[PDB]
Design a protein around this motif. Structure first.
Motif, PDB file in Angstrom:
ATOM      1  N   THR A 198      24.860  75.681 -59.493  1.00  0.00           N
ATOM      2  CA  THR A 198      26.023  74.851 -59.995  1.00  0.00           C
ATOM      3  C   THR A 198      24.953  73.695 -61.026  1.00  0.00           C
ATOM      4  O   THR A 198      25.880  73.023 -61.974  1.00  0.00           O
TER       5      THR A 198
ATOM      6  N   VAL B 262      33.460  73.841 -63.744  1.00  0.00           N
ATOM      7  CA  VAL B 262      33.323  74.014 -62.401  1.00  0.00           C
ATOM      8  C   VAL B 262      33.380  75.518 -62.380  1.00  0.00           C
ATOM      9  O   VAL B 262      34.226  76.306 -62.872  1.00  0.00           O
ATOM     10  N   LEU B 263      32.469  75.918 -61.420  1.00  0.00           N
ATOM     11  CA  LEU B 263      32.193  77.324 -61.225  1.00  0.00           C
ATOM     12  C   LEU B 263      32.659  77.943 -59.837  1.00  0.00           C
ATOM     13  O   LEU B 263      33.118  77.357 -58.793  1.00  0.00           O
ATOM     14  N   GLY B 264      33.181  79.246 -59.864  1.00  0.00           N
ATOM     15  CA  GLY B 264      33.581  79.926 -58.399  1.00  0.00           C
ATOM     16  C   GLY B 264      32.672  81.032 -57.868  1.00  0.00           C
ATOM     17  O   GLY B 264      31.640  81.231 -58.623  1.00  0.00           O
ATOM     18  N   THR B 265      33.046  81.643 -56.820  1.00  0.00           N
ATOM     19  CA  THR B 265      32.407  82.842 -56.154  1.00  0.00           C
ATOM     20  C   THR B 265      33.226  83.924 -56.190  1.00  0.00           C
ATOM     21  O   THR B 265      34.461  83.757 -56.308  1.00  0.00           O
ATOM     22  N   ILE B 266      32.587  85.082 -55.732  1.00  0.00           N
ATOM     23  CA  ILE B 266      33.586  86.212 -55.235  1.00  0.00           C
ATOM     24  C   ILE B 266      34.365  86.360 -54.148  1.00  0.00           C
ATOM     25  O   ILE B 266      35.262  86.940 -54.257  1.00  0.00           O
ATOM     26  N   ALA B 267      33.987  85.583 -53.101  1.00  0.00           N
ATOM     27  CA  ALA B 267      34.858  85.516 -52.027  1.00  0.00           C
ATOM     28  C   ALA B 267      35.279  86.863 -51.325  1.00  0.00           C
ATOM     29  O   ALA B 267      34.570  87.930 -51.387  1.00  0.00           O
TER      30      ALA B 267
ATOM     31  N   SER C  34      33.954  79.739 -49.829  1.00  0.00           N
ATOM     32  CA  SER C  34      32.293  79.479 -49.958  1.00  0.00           C
ATOM     33  C   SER C  34      32.166  78.730 -51.426  1.00  0.00           C
ATOM     34  O   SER C  34      32.037  79.655 -52.378  1.00  0.00           O
ATOM     35  N   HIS C  35      32.072  77.624 -51.415  1.00  0.00           N
ATOM     36  CA  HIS C  35      31.695  76.909 -52.738  1.00  0.00           C
ATOM     37  C   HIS C  35      30.453  77.095 -52.974  1.00  0.00           C
ATOM     38  O   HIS C  35      29.322  77.191 -52.544  1.00  0.00           O
ATOM     39  N   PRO C  36      30.206  77.375 -54.438  1.00  0.00           N
ATOM     40  CA  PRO C  36      29.104  78.076 -55.025  1.00  0.00           C
ATOM     41  C   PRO C  36      27.563  77.052 -54.652  1.00  0.00           C
ATOM     42  O   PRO C  36      27.807  75.957 -54.507  1.00  0.00           O
ATOM     43  N   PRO C  37      26.416  77.693 -54.585  1.00  0.00           N
ATOM     44  CA  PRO C  37      25.133  77.087 -54.261  1.00  0.00           C
ATOM     45  C   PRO C  37      24.665  75.902 -55.201  1.00  0.00           C
ATOM     46  O   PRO C  37      25.145  75.786 -56.325  1.00  0.00           O
TER      47      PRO C  37
ATOM     48  N   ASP D 235      32.761  83.377 -64.752  1.00  0.00           N
ATOM     49  CA  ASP D 235      32.410  82.939 -63.364  1.00  0.00           C
ATOM     50  C   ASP D 235      33.363  81.561 -62.821  1.00  0.00           C
ATOM     51  O   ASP D 235      32.829  80.907 -61.976  1.00  0.00           O
ATOM     52  N   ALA D 236      34.558  81.773 -63.432  1.00  0.00           N
ATOM     53  CA  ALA D 236      35.495  80.770 -63.200  1.00  0.00           C
ATOM     54  C   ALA D 236      37.019  80.908 -63.015  1.00  0.00           C
ATOM     55  O   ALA D 236      37.706  80.186 -63.044  1.00  0.00           O
ATOM     56  N   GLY D 237      37.099  82.407 -63.245  1.00  0.00           N
ATOM     57  CA  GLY D 237      38.467  82.920 -63.329  1.00  0.00           C
ATOM     58  C   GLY D 237      39.222  82.665 -64.516  1.00  0.00           C
ATOM     59  O   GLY D 237      40.762  82.506 -64.631  1.00  0.00           O
TER      60      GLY D 237
END
Lengths: 228, 239, 134
Positions: B141, B126-131, B134-137, B157-159
């Motif tokens: 994904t 599962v991926l994350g974003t910079i915020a 807002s769940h990734p596009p 890209d997922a902390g």
């Protein structure tokens, strides 16, 4: 510091590092407050959906694994906000998944036989109950790389464990304010597929998003690669 | 896995033939061999289609080019072959899907080049974003055949630390010695069959931990070639 | 240019398998992968590398093998007049899987040599003087 004396020359027990011992112990998972009158209590009840990703402490521990399976023991420690106890009759109702939650202090929901309820006096010792493995799947999963059908990404509804609805019994509102602490203990734990340990601060309950401007390093720094 | 001093071999599966050195230095994810799903009431009233036809073969993806500044790449499974061949149309007409994979990442570089790639498989990537929230596009994904590029490789890209990615099925590709990695991945999920279009059971990451270097004059881009082969693939349409 | 094609002109019909061999002549320091693909008779010539890969193909790494052989499973011909050939035949396509990689000091342009021959099942019938001479 680094005091180099008192050297432990014996191996300790491996039992301490077992998945079970690592996830045992009842920890506080929620603190519900029901004041007589203030902001959210002209109602007289509360609906707490069972949530583990509540406290980052326990959450980080779980996200060390991809899948987990377990039973949960809940203990209800209640008293007035200052610690005093009074002869107040309370009701805690467990609303399983797929069941309708109370929408008022007196919804029909509170009478529904299928929503197990436990009645106890605030004077009686803390109520305790065990909730099984609710998922329709073989295990709960803290990560779903798909969509359950975007804004609904990573969201797996098969982890939904239920809701607890608290309220004072009686037709009239209770004269007392109540502060209830919910403790949970994980029983019979099983874990699968170990993964990297979260090294970035958490931003949301439902996703791994991290602050991308302030990306913290896993380790502290030093001047030269030779100074120690 | 595969490096210098290995007898070259020509493996063929169907109408495909790849020349790759025989190095029994293979990684078998989590210690298990891909197998055909145990019995379940669902496919006990509707057997699971096991197209051994043009489905069990070597799908060689488009080659990616590794430069001095590349950050890393990743592909999602089964998404990667969702838009490709009979594994695609077979993975679209059937409600339920289940499979394993022999994944083969391969490099082509001269002995005057240097670098080191880490090849790993991460279940439920599962991926994350910079915020803000807002769940990734959907385009990042499920990147498809082309794959996607990591933006923050240090935290995948997922902390989560790249420094710890090795607790997952991995294999290093150190240009100095071996030039190719091999990983056997078995089906991993909380249920026997999932949707091949909704859920991505895992991700393949290839991140350069020690950057490509060479002296000006040598080919500036090293080709990374990924070859995938489904193992014990099953489909259940429910009809 | 092949001895096979020259002898085929001396006959009216023929059929069998063929084998084409590719040899790489470049510096021992070069490496890379080429994709060889056979598109069956009455098939659409591959448009991109990816489609060719879905058909009968061979990933050839000339860093490992200096030579590789492909086999045309079956071809047939039934030469007639009206001049037209009832030739059932595929299309070999050579693609760059990876680019040509080479270190400093080695030629950046190398050559491939193609050799071909008929297999054992190849046979011909009905003689006819050629048109290759005058």
């Amino acid at each position: 510091n680094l005091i180099e004396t008192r050297c432990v020359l014996n191996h300790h027990s491996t039992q301490e590092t077992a998945i079970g011992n690592f996830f045992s112990r009842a920890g506080l998972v929620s603190i519900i407050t029901m004041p007589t009158t203030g902001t959210q209590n002209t109602d007289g009840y509360v609906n707490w959906d069972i949530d583990l990703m509540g406290y980052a402490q326990l959450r980080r521990k779980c996200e060390l694994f991809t899948y987990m399976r377990f039973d949960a023991e809940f203990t209800f420690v209640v008293a007035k906000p200052n610690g005093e106890l009074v002869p107040q009759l309370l009701q805690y109702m467990y609303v399983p998944p797929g069941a309708p939650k109370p929408t008022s202090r007196d919804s029909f929901a509170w009478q529904t036989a299928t929503n197990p309820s436990v009645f106890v006096k605030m004077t009686d010792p803390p109520a305790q109950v065990s909730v099984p493995f609710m998922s329709p799947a073989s295990a709960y999963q803290w990560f779903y790389d798909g969509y359950p059908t975007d804004l609904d990404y990573g969201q797996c509804p098969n982890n939904m464990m239920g809701t607890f609805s608290i309220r004072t019994v009686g037709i009239e509102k209770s004269p007392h304010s109540i502060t209830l602490r919910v403790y949970m203990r994980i029983k019979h734990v099983r874990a699968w597929i170990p993964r990297p340990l979260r090294n970035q601060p958490y931003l949301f309950k439902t996703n791994p998003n991290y602050k991308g401007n302030d990306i913290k390093c896993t380790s502290t720094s030093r001047d030269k690669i030779t100074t120690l | 896995a595969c490096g210098y001093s290995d007898r070259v071999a020509q493996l063929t599966i169907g109408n495909s033939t790849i020349t790759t050195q025989e190095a029994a230095n293979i990684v078998i994810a989590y210690g298990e061999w891909p197998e055909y799903c145990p019995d379940t009431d669902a496919t006990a009233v509707d057997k699971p289609t096991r197209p051994d036809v043009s489905v069990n073969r070597f799908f060689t993806l488009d080659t990616k080019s590794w430069a001095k500044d590349s950050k890393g790449w990743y592909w999602k499974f089964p998404d990667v072959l969702t838009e490709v061949g009979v594994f695609g149309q077979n993975a679209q007409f059937h409600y339920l899907y289940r499979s394993g994979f022999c994944v083969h990442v391969q490099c082509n570089a001269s002995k005057f080049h240097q670098g080191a790639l880490l090849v790993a498989v991460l279940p439920e990537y599962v991926l994350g974003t910079i915020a803000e929230n807002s769940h990734p596009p959907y385009a990042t994904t499920q990147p498809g055949q082309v794959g996607a590029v990591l933006t923050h490789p240090y935290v995948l890209d997922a902390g989560i630390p790249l420094s710890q990615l090795t607790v997952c099925p991995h294999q290093w590709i150190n240009l100095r010695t071996n030039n190719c990695a091999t990983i056997i991945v078995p089906y991993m999920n909380t249920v026997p069959f999932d949707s091949a279009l909704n859920h991505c059971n895992f991700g393949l990451l290839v991140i350069p931990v020690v950057p490509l270097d060479f002296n000006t004059g040598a080919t500036s881009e090293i080709p990374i070639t990924v070859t995938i082969a489904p193992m014990c693939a099953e489909f259940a349409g429910l009809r | 240019s092949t001895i096979l094609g020259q002898l085929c002109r001396y006959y009216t019909q023929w059929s069998g398998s063929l084998e084409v061999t590719f040899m790489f002549a470049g510096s021992f320091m070069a490496t890379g992968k080429m994709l060889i693909a056979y598109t069956p008779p009455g098939g659409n010539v591959p448009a991109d590398r990816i489609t060719a890969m879905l058909g009968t193909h061979v990933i050839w790494d000339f860093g490992l093998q200096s030579s590789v052989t492909l086999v045309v499973p079956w071809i047939s011909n039934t030469h007639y007049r009206a001049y037209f050939d009832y030739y059932t035949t595929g299309i070999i396509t050579i693609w760059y899987q990876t680019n040509y990689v080479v270190p400093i000091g080695a030629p950046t342009t190398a050559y491939i040599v193609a050799l071909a021959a008929a297999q054992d099942n190849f046979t011909m019938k009905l003689c006819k003087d050629t048109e290759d001479i005058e």
